[PDB]
From a paper:
The main protease of SARS-CoV-2 (Mpro, also referred to as 3-chymotrypsin-like protease or 3CLpro) is responsible for the majority of nsp processing, cleaving at 11 conserved sites along the polyprotein including self-excision of Mpro by autolytic cleavage of its own N-terminal and C-terminal autoprocessing sites. SARS-CoV-2 Mpro is a functional homodimer of two symmetrically disposed protomers that are each 306 residues in length (33.8 kDa). Using C-terminally substituted Mpro chimeras, we have determined X-ray crystallographic structures of Mpro in complex with 10 of its 11 viral cleavage sites, bound at full occupancy intermolecularly in trans, within the active site of either the native enzyme and/or a catalytic mutant (C145A).
Cleavage site C8 has crystallized with the same approximate unit cell dimensions and relative Mpro dimer orientation in the crystal lattice as that of the earlier structure for C5; however, the C8 crystallographic data is defined by the space group P212121 with four protomer molecules in the asymmetric unit (ASU) compared to space group C2 and two molecules for C5. Primarily small beta-branched residues, threonine or valine, are observed at P3, with C8, C9 and C10 having extended side chains with significant aliphatic character (lysine, arginine or methionine).
Author numbering:
A (entry chain A): 1 to 306
B (entry chain C): 1 to 302
The structure:
Amino acid sequence: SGFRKMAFPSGKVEGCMVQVTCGTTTLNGLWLDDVVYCPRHVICTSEDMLNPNYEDLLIRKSNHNFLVQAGNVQLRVIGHSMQNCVLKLKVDTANPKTPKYKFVRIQPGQTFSVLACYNGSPSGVYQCAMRPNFTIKGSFLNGSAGSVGFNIDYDCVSFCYMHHMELPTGVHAGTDLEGNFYGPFVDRQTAQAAGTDTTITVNVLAWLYAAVINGDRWFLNRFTTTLNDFNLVAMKYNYEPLTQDHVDILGPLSAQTGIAVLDMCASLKELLQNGMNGRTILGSALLEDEFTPFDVVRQCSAVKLQ
Amino acid sequence: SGFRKMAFPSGKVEGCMVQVTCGTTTLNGLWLDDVVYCPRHVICTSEDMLNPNYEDLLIRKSNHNFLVQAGNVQLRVIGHSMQNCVLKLKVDTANPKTPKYKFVRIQPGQTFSVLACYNGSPSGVYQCAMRPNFTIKGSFLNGSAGSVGFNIDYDCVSFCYMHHMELPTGVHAGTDLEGNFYGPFVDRQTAQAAGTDTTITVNVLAWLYAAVINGDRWFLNRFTTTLNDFNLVAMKYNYEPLTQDHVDILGPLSAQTGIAVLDMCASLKELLQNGMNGRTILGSALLEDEFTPFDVVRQCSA
């Protein structure tokens, strides 16, 4: 029992992290087969970051201006190219530790594990969600760029995030592994702001189910609301609107608990309007929105009476 | 910036997890050099768990009763001995992925990473604190026993916890890697209760320093206190005592932010006596006590 924000074991991704130097800048890269992926702003100097012309910066480079290290093993760079906001370095050696992998672009509300790295070395792992404003509420310092987010299904690693920068409100932005940014952000050291961040309603509901399964049930109401009725309250408290597809996703959690989904919505409604009266839910004083319904299912398996 | 429960990367520990089976009982083992460490209840049926005589149960086993499986390769057990509540199985192959390691017994309030495993196969990793009542609040299902807790210091894995069992409140109980339980618990199926938990005061202060480092500045007040006066309020609010040794541990964070340790004691005293008045600290409406001072510097400094 118990219920924790849990990250995937990071060993497979650790086997892919390398150090990428260009000029005087070191950050992290991802070594898959014979390609190293990393943020293109590794070619900037500290003078270049207000409005870099990345094409112009890159034609000034050659393979000799990149140093890639996989641990103490040197990787000879034999090609480079720029795809959107990621640099792809071709190297003379395919990574023998390459897992089965995919590149996927996740939707807001979906979670993933982050392996934070500095100078090519894994430093920590933790669980994150793509927020509705396309930021990540992470923990990153200077030198973390090129850290990646991922999920593991079976033995296949789905890479979904590569980290580029920190917005001044203390949240983080980055790209998929094809280099397309999540959200309206660009890789420059300019003034940009996260949009208003809303709460992921479906995930809050899944977390409440997790609380019920683990015995925390003080907040339930035998009351049924409607989708339209709930959504009026949702917009008042800056919650993502709830769709019928959200209700479908929560069907299995609903069967295991014997609490219908619109009952749980009425329970969540009452928490929004009245607060939690000084009690906690799963050790938390806030409504938690970074567990997906699948994340809850993996961690709270139960017998079904038939 | 940002502050998050952050575990150490699990790769070096994943290379040590094996599956240990004795009869119809399977749990997790830690393979280091030519030894596998696992909870001794691997040698029990459902019936034995009521009141096991572990010595008599073990002396009835042989090497061949023990199935150790590392991935797709089985290892031969070539000796077995019991150390307190853990079993040490000698295996005929030294783990080529053995990291530099040490075994440490940790104190309440310290944190560690847990690599939850089922059937010898890693499932997930997360941070835990050793509570003052010597339990942890983890996420362990049946079959997770033998999962281990660890810190990584440079190239070295300090193993400090191995999981054994679940208590009636859903908290978890375990041993160090010498098989000595944390807390008054025993590896038998009888009613045992976690003691009254207390808030790890020095960790709360460390978390407040982490807030200020991130920019959450509002709880500060230039009112101050003595250590003896602060603890009087601490006692009443079920907070652990704050020792001079705790004040020393916070010294490095004190000089980073510029806030004297007892000044942050005075601010937390105000937080306890009034509540937070609807605000949050580091995106929490509660005073978080599961980040040590070392955990904070790990996340805010170079």
